[PDB]
């Protein structure tokens, strides 16, 4: 198939790391050609050993048997050390490779899919690819390397045999096949015909009734030993034929034997023949069938590990998030307006938000309120440029957002929300993340602390600087809420979506949080996502969306006298 | 378990087979003696045979094989053909004696137990049971023969050598054990300790909104950098332990090799050992490792083999039916009458008959009328005693049928229906089925004829002789109707039960079952399970039973004037 062109766009990452690879493999060739040693020892034992009296040549026997094991289990080490060393290296550049294209992809992604799938992506595939691609490489190197260190120790012993033996065993291989396939035939046959009689014991087991009205319990006896007697006489001929198979078997085998020692029997063959040579040759005909077996398997194995790494390598050049803009924008002071935007989401057919006038004013506040899944949130989600409009316009500092960079628009634009992801760092690290070499650690003192989220960090282990994370230290709801808004007050951010909490928490944190985003955070260009009431009160211009269409605009006294939608809603609340 | 116990319970079936089972026990050994003498020709073949110029022992070799082959084959064959002969003969008494005792269990039993299980339970355990047994026996046998056979060869020719080989060998077994053991608890702590640092990985990678809109893509990259090389290294930390488990393994192997060349190479074993003794010790002990694992494995399979036998034994001992009746009844003349019959369906909680008060007077005629499953045809089930009232009495002929044989009573009652039973056989032995013996040909084809079922019959192949069956020659409804009609007709049964067909049948099907049935076959004390209204209207004494009991009893006339249901179901018709 197609996998060799897999691993040939593969080796590049291999490449760096030769060297191990090449100590590998001189391990693996060394290890063989110790165990085909190991074999050869076998002659002398058999010959100038035990024969005779010479003391010798086996006083030293265990000796060469201890340094040849210890020679195997060094090399053995040696090998698959180095081999994982490359495997593990392989992996590391794969994984890095993988996750720095992956953070970048369009969101709609780990929407659709879970983070599970994904991390088993990352994870297990490239480990199953390495393991694959190692093993079938381990295996074609050492058994190879057996395999011909037998065949030319069996050609170098006694040609004379050695020809004979591997011209004999195909031979009596496919014989072996033959028979076995032929009365195999014959044991389909009699199977599929054996169903010709079990109808008769079936058909009298079920007139139960009319037996018995009728009184007729010796006749169906009778009956029933006839098909009986029947039913015993083709299991004897099934039988049979079942047991005749084996001994052909064992036939040709021995037979096969028998051809062997007559044809050593000449003596055009004995002209270099002892009884070390013989047993040599005998024991490395029978120790050579298992490479030959994995050999055959190690091509299935390498084809299904390619074909895996081949849809990971699909996977790696997937389609990226666009940057067509050029423009960087730097302190926006303008209005956010969006201009007939309609939007669907990919994947879903119904649009989630239709055709939407919305004007969005500098450092005025906006109070956009409606249902669980009215598009409430799909407008937060734009205004980022997470989802790309269908049509329409966003039209921000005069100019739209695909015009612009991605990096300084989403640095245009900060996200307060209840609910924020805590990264494995310290507090310092996390209220400056990704610009802690732009900012002080008096500035981050200080925006924590007009976050009124500085008074929990001193009764922290070592307050400014303890590790946070999803796996270690956890902060509360408000607590997390606080270090967000620290964070957006230090960068200063322009623009703010705020997503606002569905539950009251404590009244120390309560009061906490909404002193600090009120008078502190609330002084720039604002969309907040309200949920309480009191929000909405305290809002220049509350716009209520629902099925992705506005229904009424205004200020909360001009809603209530216009007694629409809103006005019930805030009856209800 | 209780296994052997069963083993005794079946010894007696064999036991008139003894002389088969000796033959197969005679030839097993033989084998087995073969096979090891196969063995012990290894010896003088590199003794005196490849070594020095012994031209004779060496070409003898091939036809001692060959000999040796051929008796083990034609041995193999007798075996496993006795073997064979046993197990047969052996199922086919089991088969008889379950069958025999089958035919007397409570009709219950296949109205809860399909035929299928019930035929699953006659041929397939008892050939699983028979297949287990014969296959233990053979193991065990086979491979005791041999594996003492190779004790016996092992010692005679060099105990120096075969005590220490097996002293030697279970000390290795036990240290590979302990030594997997230990590297697989090593293996085990380390696979669950490492699900510590793929969660922090998964971590970083659900905040892909975070990292977006903060722009901290270098950050998360040297992240996941960190965290790659971790665990890349304790993926290393892995394979070093798994790779220096193996080496481990042949190194206590090869010691032991070692160790058994060091042993030989004193003086102390070397009284006694030449090349070929060396290899047929160690060739024996190789080739003795599968008959241990063999002879290991028969245990359970003569366990579960046994507990299948018991559960059919178990089967075979059950219930039958109660037969503590002892008067006879020749040609009842009487009526039959239902005394506050109150019945349930064993299995079910609702009565299906209830407290009922019925007169079916001698050689007059009733029609039970009613829906499907309101109790018609349990009655009909009743008077048979196919299953017994829980209160009430069935008086026929001045006595309860508890009083009577089964056999009597049932010979006492005919069954004509359009669903009859024909059993494989001929016209002649079906029509005077369990009677052949009492009526002759003459009145057979009279019965036949005045059942007007005789001109479908000279139309056959062979006319009153033609094989009929259920896997046969197969006859229409409206055949199988008149034949019946014949059945009970040659037999002149004093009580009819007719279940009445629910479909008109052709023309002259129609006529021929009717004219039959009303001018030649009702003529005596008949209860008919009307479903047409012509058989209706010309009744004697008509009762209408719902699910629960009967409503009215009377004539066809009176029964209309009486306006019950029975107007209402005429109505319909």
Redesign the interface.
């Known amino acids: 198939l197609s996998t060799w062109q897999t691993f040939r766009r593969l080796w590049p990452t291999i490449a760096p790391f030769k060297a191990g690879l090449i100590v590998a493999g001189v391990a693996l060739i060394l290890n063989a050609a110790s165990d085909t040693f190991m074999l050869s020892l076998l002659k002398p034992?058999?010959?100038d050993?035990?024969?005779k009296t010479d003391?010798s040549v086996?006083?030293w026997?265990?000796?060469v048997?201890?340094g040849?094991?210890?020679l195997?289990?060094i090399t053995?080490?040696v090998s698959?050390?180095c081999i994982?060393?490359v495997s593990?290296?392989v992996?590391?550049t794969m994984?890095?490779r993988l996750?720095?294209h992956?953070?970048?992809m369009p969101?709609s992604f780990?929407d659709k899919q879970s983070?599970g799938t994904?991390?088993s992506r990352?994870?297990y595939d490239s480990e199953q690819v390495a393991s694959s691609s190692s093993g079938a490489l381990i295996t074609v190197v050492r058994e190879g390397a057996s395999i011909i260190g037998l065949f030319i120790m069996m050609f170098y012993y006694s040609w004379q045999l050695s020809i004979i033996l591997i011209v004999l065993a195909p031979i009596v291989s496919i014989a072996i096949r033959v028979v076995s396939k032929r009365f195999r035939n014959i044991s389909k046959n009699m199977q599929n015909t054996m169903g010709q009689v079990?109808?008769?014991?079936?058909?009298?087991?079920?007139?139960?009734?009319?037996?018995?009205?009728?009184?007729?319990?010796?006749?169906?006896?009778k009956?029933?030993?006839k098909v009986?007697?029947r039913?015993?006489l083709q299991?004897?001929k099934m039988?049979?034929a079942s047991?005749?198979s084996?001994?052909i078997i064992?036939?040709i085998a021995?037979?096969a034997?028998?051809?062997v020692?007559?044809a050593?029997?000449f003596p055009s063959v004995?002209d270099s023949?002892?009884?070390?040579t013989?047993?040599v040759v005998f024991s490395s005909m029978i120790a050579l069938m298992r490479p030959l077996k994995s050999l055959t398997n190690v091509n299935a194995q390498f084809q299904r590990g390619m074909a895996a790494c081949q849809t990971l390598f699909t996977i790696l050049d997937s389609e990226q998030e666009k940057d067509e803009g050029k423009r960087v924008i730097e302190r926006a002071t303008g209005d956010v307006e969006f201009r007939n935007v309609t939007f669907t989401y990919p994947g879903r057919d119904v649009p989630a938000l239709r055709n939407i006038n919305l004007k969005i004013p500098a450092g005025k506040t906006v109070a956009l309120v409606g249902r669980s899944g009215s598009g409430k949130s799909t407008i937060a989600s734009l205004i980022?440029r997470?989802y790309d409009i269908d049509e329409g316009e966003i039209l921000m500092d005069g100019h739209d957002l695909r015009e612009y960079t991605?990096?300084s628009l989403?640095?245009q634009?900060?996200?307060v929300s209840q609910n924020?992801?805590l990264?494995?760092d310290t507090v310092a690290n996390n209220i400056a993340?990704?610009?802690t070499e732009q900012y002080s650690r008096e500035q981050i003192e200080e925006a924590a602390r007009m976050a009124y989220a500085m008074d929990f960090i001193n009764k922290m282990d070592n307050g400014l600087d303890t590790v946070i994370?999803?796996?270690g230290v956890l902060l509360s709801g408000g607590q997390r809420q606080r270090i967000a808004i620290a964070?957006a007050l230090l960068?200063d951010s322009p623009i703010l979506i705020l997503d606002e909490a569905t539950s009251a928490l404590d009244t120390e944190s309560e009061r906490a949080i909404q002193a600090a985003l009120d008078e502190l955070q609330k002084n720039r260009t604002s969309l907040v996502i309200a949920h309480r009431l009191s929000t909405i009160e305290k809002a220049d211009e509350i716009v209520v969306v629902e099925d992705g269409v506005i229904v009424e605009r205004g200020t909360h006294n001009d809603l209530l006298e216009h007694r629409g939608v809103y006005a019930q809603l805030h009856k209800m609340q």
């Open positions: 034992l058999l010959d050993g035990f024969g003391r086996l006083v026997m265990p000796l048997v201890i040849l094991m210890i195997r289990g053995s080490y698959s050390y994982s060393w593990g290296k992996v590391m994984r890095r996750f720095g992956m953070m970048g969101v780990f983070t994904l991390l990352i994870t079990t109808t008769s014991a079936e058909q009298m087991l079920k007139g139960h009734k009319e037996v018995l009205i009728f009184g007729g319990q010796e006749v169906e006896t009956r029933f030993d009986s007697n039913m015993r299991g004897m039988v049979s047991s005749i084996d001994p064992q036939l021995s037979l034997l028998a051809f020692l007559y050593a029997s004995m023949l002892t009884a070390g013989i047993t980022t997470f991605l990096a989403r640095n634009v900060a996200l924020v992801h990264f494995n993340y990704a610009r994370g999803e796996n964070r960068r």
